[PDB]
């Protein structure tokens, strides 16, 4: 159970996602149903070491973006092919 | 860069040391700093022959009193 941040974003392609990783930010997405999710940017490290324990994934999260708060828990994770740091993460609403 | 040369040895090669240069008048340290800054063979020699340095702060080879200069 942690207090994390987001700015709202949507991208397409390798080049864009790499332009986030150029300044030590990366993307994420918020699903539920079968609809258009809430697409966000995250920080590399504000979600890796808070993630070094199972409480990130078992318990719900205060994620703040432009006065919106929605509640979410982590799902399966995408990792770099040369670093343990987070390339892309999934979330479900909780 | 301790400037090895052929001069005849056995077992190794004989050399000049960086260390020799200071003991046998102060010039040689200053001297292979400006030498190495000039071109090729012949031009680097035509340039070179215009430098004098000697023992330094004590040398008679200054009696002219030239144009004074700070750089």
């Amino acid at each position: 159970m942690f207090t994390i941040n987001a700015e709202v974003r949507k991208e397409q392609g390798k080049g864009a996602s790499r332009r986030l990783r150029a300044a030590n930010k990366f993307p994420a997405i918020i699903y539920g149903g079968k609809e258009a999710p809430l697409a966000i940017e995250l920080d590399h490290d504000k979600v890796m070491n808070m993630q070094a324990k199972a409480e990130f994934y078992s318990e719900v999260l205060t994620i703040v973006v432009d006065g919106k708060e929605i509640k979410v828990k982590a799902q399966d994770v995408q990792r770099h092919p040369y670093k343990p740091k987070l390339q892309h993460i999934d979330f479900v609403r909780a | 860069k301790v400037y090895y040369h052929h001069t005849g040895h056995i077992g190794g090669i004989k050399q000049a040391t960086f260390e020799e240069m200071i003991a046998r008048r102060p010039e040689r340290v200053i001297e292979i700093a400006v030498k190495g800054m000039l071109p090729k063979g012949p031009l680097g020699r035509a340039m070179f022959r215009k430098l004098k340095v000697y023992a330094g702060n004590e040398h008679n080879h200054a009696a002219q009193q030239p144009q004074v200069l700070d750089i």
Partner: protein, 136 residues
Amino acid sequence: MLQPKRTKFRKMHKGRNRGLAQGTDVSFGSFGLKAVGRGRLTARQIEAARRAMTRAVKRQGKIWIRVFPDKPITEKPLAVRMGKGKGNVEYWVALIQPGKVLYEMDGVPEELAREAFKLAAAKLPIKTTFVTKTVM
């Protein structure tokens, strides 16, 4: 060597890649050893690494193995001129790809599994990373 009985066929093409040929994430446990580089293992190195982990952990925790030797590799010895056919089958090779996790654990405490992987990384040809999973 900790190698398979028969995969595919007995004599096979070497297996080059321009990027990823599978394996890049954690798949079991709460922690493991990630490669973060690429290259070959003759199965002898996998064994050597397994011994190191079994000498540190003992009975506390079971080991899940996340790699195996896939492709048989021929040698044509350094005693005869190259250009004419394909050599005897010599070793089975595991292809490690970039960020391929090799071994995972959960039974034993985190610091025993992490230390056990540092010993195992000296038996390996690259510099590696301890990788944490926690559940997924």
